[PDB]
């Protein structure tokens, strides 16, 4: 059992988006489909729902997304599509599809983001922060991975290929005065280390496809 | 459309001692079977929401006996009868008697323990960034509790008022801690310009406020 989310991204204002939420390991047909939304640091909003087939595949919109949407369902494909038209600004938001029924019941996908903006996509540049006597107190050591400069959100950072996960923190993206975002993401490890254990932050801007791995060297 | 209004919005809990969340209903959610169409689900950080009681008091598959919910009609109580740093997070409750399903506000539940001060880490600009044209001086405070911490940057004892941006991090899900990073923008013609840049960290777990530093050049 899988939900996969895609078709969000960037998407100029007045456009068109249709997001598909792909179920595996148990059929639709028999499931509602629910779609809900969230804004960056905001609550939960119901966007509309497809019902079972044995309730007449029965479709239902939020008022606040009036006669813009489609939900429907392609059993063949067993995916449900949510079909967005003359977007705003006001529609960026973290898009959830919700399975209500035997299987994955009340349980939500991952999501994925649409951003609605006149700014275009542009990959990020990643510097290494690295470790040194300034970011060394006691026996810890800090480094790190900026990731600067780019449109829109978001960026996956793992290190050492997800096998340095105790004492990461990758920081909330900040939108920079130029419109472009930028985060850091850090690690706190033995400094006994430093000189032995290789530090490689993967940074991945799929929007743009930029994909870096970079190595974090002491000094 | 029936309004959900949760109380309170946000509380701050030691682990091993209960909470409890209020939600409210503008319209009946009581079933002709004497269960209610009211549910709950928990936003934890980084996450999409989960389920955690349907029906008005039916624990979701995986969902422990300390989270309990109760209540009829329209006054409903969401119950954690011993906290644990992993219910960290944002507690929302749903109608879902009729379409648009709404939501309340979302509560957010704080992990309540002891004052931890932060480790404090100063990154000058990288060599390559310096190489690109821009500068970013990067002050990372790690672990520490409460979130309230103030950062001052200071370039050759001149306070810098307006080009630094922060990010703190979701309260951690295992030892309850925030971290924050401090971004101070400068061109390089700035940067190349002055020596001493330093990072002044003030939190309730330091006696005195800490300051970590560094000479560009190294002195």
């Known amino acids: 059992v899988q939900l996969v989310e895609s078709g969000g991204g960037l998407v100029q204002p007045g456009g068109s988006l249709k997001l598909s939420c792909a179920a595996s390991?148990?059929?639709?047909?028999?499931?509602?489909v629910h779609w809900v939304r969230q804004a960056s640091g905001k609550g939960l909003e119901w966007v509309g729902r497809?019902?079972?087939?044995?309730?007449?595949?029965?479709?239902a919109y939020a008022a606040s997304m009036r006669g813009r949407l489609t939900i429907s369902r392609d059993d063949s494909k067993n995916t449900a599509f949510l079909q967005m038209n003359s977007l705003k600004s006001d529609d960026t938001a973290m898009y959830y599809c919700?399975?209500?029924?035997?299987?994955?019941?009340?349980?939500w996908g991952q999501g994925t983001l649409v951003t609605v903006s006149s700014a275009s996509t542009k990959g990020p540049s990643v510097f290494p922060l690295a470790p040194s006597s300034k970011s060394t107190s006691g026996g810890t050591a800090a480094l790190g991975c900026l990731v600067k400069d780019y449109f829109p959100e978001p960026v996956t950072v793992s290190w050492n290929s997800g096998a340095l996960t105790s004492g990461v923190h990758t920081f909330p993206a900040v939108l920079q005065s130029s419109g472009l975002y930028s985060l850091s993401s850090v690690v706190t490890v033995p400094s006994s280390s430093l000189g032995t254990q290789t530090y490689i932050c993967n940074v991945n801007h799929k929007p743009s496809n930029t994909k870096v791995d970079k190595r974090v060297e002491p000094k | 459309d029936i309004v959900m209004t949760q109380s309170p919005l946000s509380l701050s809990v030691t682990p091993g001692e209960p909470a409890s969340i209020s939600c409210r209903s503008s319209?009946?959610?009581?079933?002709?079977?004497?269960?209610?169409?009211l549910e709950w689900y928990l936003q934890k950080p980084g996450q999409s929401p989960q389920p955690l009681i349907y029906?008005?008091?039916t624990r979701a598959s995986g969902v422990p006996d300390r989270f309990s919910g109760s209540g009829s009609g329209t006054d409903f109580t969401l119950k954690i009868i011993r906290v644990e740093a992993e219910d960290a997070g944002t507690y929302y409750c749903?109608?879902?008697?009729?379409?648009?399903?709404?939501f309340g506000q979302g509560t957010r539940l704080e992990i309540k323990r002891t004052v931890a001060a932060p480790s404090v880490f100063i990154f000058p600009p990288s060599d390559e960034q310096l190489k690109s044209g821009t500068a970013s001086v990067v002050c990372l405070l790690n672990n520490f509790y409460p979130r309230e911490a103030k950062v001052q940057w200071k370039v050759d004892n001149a306070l810098q008022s307006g080009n630094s941006q922060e990010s703190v991090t979701e309260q951690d899900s295992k030892d309850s801690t925030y971290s924050l990073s401090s971004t101070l923008t400068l061109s390089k013609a700035d940067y190349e310009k002055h020596k001493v840049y330093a990072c002044e960290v003030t939190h309730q777990g330091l006696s005195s406020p800490v300051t970590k530093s560094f000479n560009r050049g190294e002195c």
């Open positions: 390991g148990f059929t639709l047909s028999g499931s509602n």
């Open positions: 319209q009946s959610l009581l079933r002709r079977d004497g269960h209610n169409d």
């Open positions: 029906l008005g008091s």
């Open positions: 497809i019902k079972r087939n044995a309730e007449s595949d029965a479709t």
């Open positions: 919700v399975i209500r029924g035997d299987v994955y019941n009340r349980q």
């Open positions: 749903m109608q879902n008697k009729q379409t648009p399903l709404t």
